[PDB]
């Protein structure tokens, strides 16, 4: 239960040297994809920011645009992602997943459901520092209904800290969920939102087992029978995140890679955002559930420099 990333500190790091290797590979005709991809995918995000800074004092060039110009396709979208400061990545995805005429509820749901209260607190702060408004305000602007109310509950980053399992409360919650869905003519979505969004992780795990005991349906089965659309997805993401975030994301990527069209935004976002958190566990949880290493579905749906990067980002 010690979650592991795949990208770690590069020993003998030299921001200026690393920076020269980039301008040297970036400068002149086209670009030298291998040197960039193999350089970045091996340097921790922190070192990537130090390099990106050395590059600017050295040449007076903003390293990033020197990449969002010499590059294009899906390799650019990836390296650009890798370059995004860890602290700003989620808030960035949310901002652009929110400056949509349409909306990738997948991004909001994915991020706001799998991130801890501590992470959510940081995300909210940086979002209001990088852009002009509150993350909550912008969310309430592109969403409506229960899908919005669940996201707003989550965004409060208030979830109870797990501190002891009270049986009576576990049965009351399991019983309340039961009475608000399966046994209700219609649905009481508000009871689901409150339970799933504020109770502690440990408590909720105890509630999901008891719910299966008293009803015969996994909470996910009931969620499928009782809810639909955006709310269904979020509710499913919260429960799966409560059970295991590594298993959840490991699941997310499969349905992006095994779809009616490969969603490259998810394969990239999930692997980049988790590259330093638990992308190793997302791999372990992959070889066990979906039955296939993350290493392979990469080596079987992508091409060019895009692959070698992803493969090096996963870690054999
Ligand atoms: Ca050039
Ligand atoms: Ca019902």
Curated annotation (Swiss-Prot):
Q: Crosslinked positions for Glycyl lysine isopeptide (Lys-Gly) (interchain with G-Cter in SUMO2)?
A: 27
Gene3D superfamilies xrefs: Annexin (1.10.220.10)
Q: Where is this motif: [IL]-x-C-x-x-[DE] motif?
A: 312-316
Return the GO cellular component terms, semicolon-separated. Answer: collagen-containing extracellular matrix; cytoplasm; cytosol; endothelial microparticle; external side of plasma membrane; extracellular exosome; extracellular region; focal adhesion
The family database entries (Pfam families) matched by this protein are listed as: Annexin (PF00191)
**Annotated cross-link Glycyl lysine isopeptide (Lys-Gly) (interchain with G-Cter in SUMO1) - which positions?**
27
Annexin repeat ranges are: 13-84, 85-156, 168-240, 244-315
Give the superkingdom in one word.
Eukaryota
User: What is one GO biological process annotated to this record?
Assistant: negative regulation of coagulation
Please list the residues that carry the modification N6-succinyllysine.
288
Q: Which residues carry this modification: Phosphoserine?
A: 35
Disease linked to the protein: Pregnancy loss, recurrent, 3: A common complication of pregnancy, resulting in spontaneous abortion before the fetus has reached viability. The term includes all miscarriages from the time of conception until 24 weeks of gestation. Recurrent pregnancy loss is defined as 3 or more consecutive spontaneous abortions.
Quote the entry's note on domains. The [IL]-x-C-x-x-[DE] motif is a proposed target motif for cysteine S-nitrosylation mediated by the iNOS-S100A8/A9 transnitrosylase complex. A pair of annexin repeats may form one binding site for calcium and phospholipid.
Stated name of the protein = Annexin A5
Q: Which organism is it from?
A: Homo sapiens (Human)
């Amino acid at each position: 239960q010690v979650l592991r990333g795949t990208v770690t500190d590069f020993p003998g790091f030299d921001e200026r040297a690393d920076a020269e290797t980039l301008r040297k590979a970036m400068k002149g005709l086209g670009t030298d994809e291998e040197s960039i991809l193999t350089l970045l995918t091996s340097r921790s995000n922190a070192q990537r920011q130090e390099i990106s800074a050395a590059f600017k004092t050295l040449f007076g060039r903003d390293l990033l645009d020197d990449l969002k110009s010499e590059l294009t396709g899906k390799f650019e979208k990836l390296i650009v992602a890798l370059m995004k400061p860890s602290r700003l990545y989620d808030a960035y995805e949310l901002k652009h997943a929110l400056k949509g005429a349409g909306t990738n509820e997948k991004v909001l749901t994915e991020i706001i459901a799998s991130r801890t209260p501590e992470e959510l607190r940081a995300i909210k702060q940086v979002y209001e520092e990088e852009y002009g408004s509150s993350l909550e305000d912008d969310v309430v602007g592109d969403t409506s209904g229960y899908y919005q109310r669940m996201l707003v509950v989550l965004l409060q980053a208030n979830r109870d800290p797990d501190a002891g399992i009270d049986e009576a409360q576990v049965e009351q919650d399991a019983q309340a969920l039961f009475q608000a869905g399966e046994l209700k003519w219609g649905t009481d979505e508000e009871k689901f939102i409150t339970i799933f969004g504020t109770r502690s992780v440990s408590h909720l795990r105890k509630v999901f087992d008891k719910y299966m005991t008293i009803s015969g349906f996994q909470i996910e089965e009931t969620i499928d029978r009782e809810t639909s659309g955006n709310l269904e997805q979020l509710l499913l993401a919260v429960v799966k995140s409560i059970r295991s975030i590594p298993a959840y994301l490991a699941e997310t990527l499969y349905y992006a890679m095994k779809g009616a069209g490969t969603d490259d935004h998810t394969l990239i976002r999930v692997m980049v955002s988790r590259s330093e958190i638990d992308l190793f566990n997302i791999r372990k949880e992959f070889r066990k559930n979906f039955a296939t290493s993350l290493y392979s579905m990469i080596k079987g749906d992508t091409s060019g420099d895009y692959k070698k990067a992803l493969l090096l980002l996963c870690g054999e």
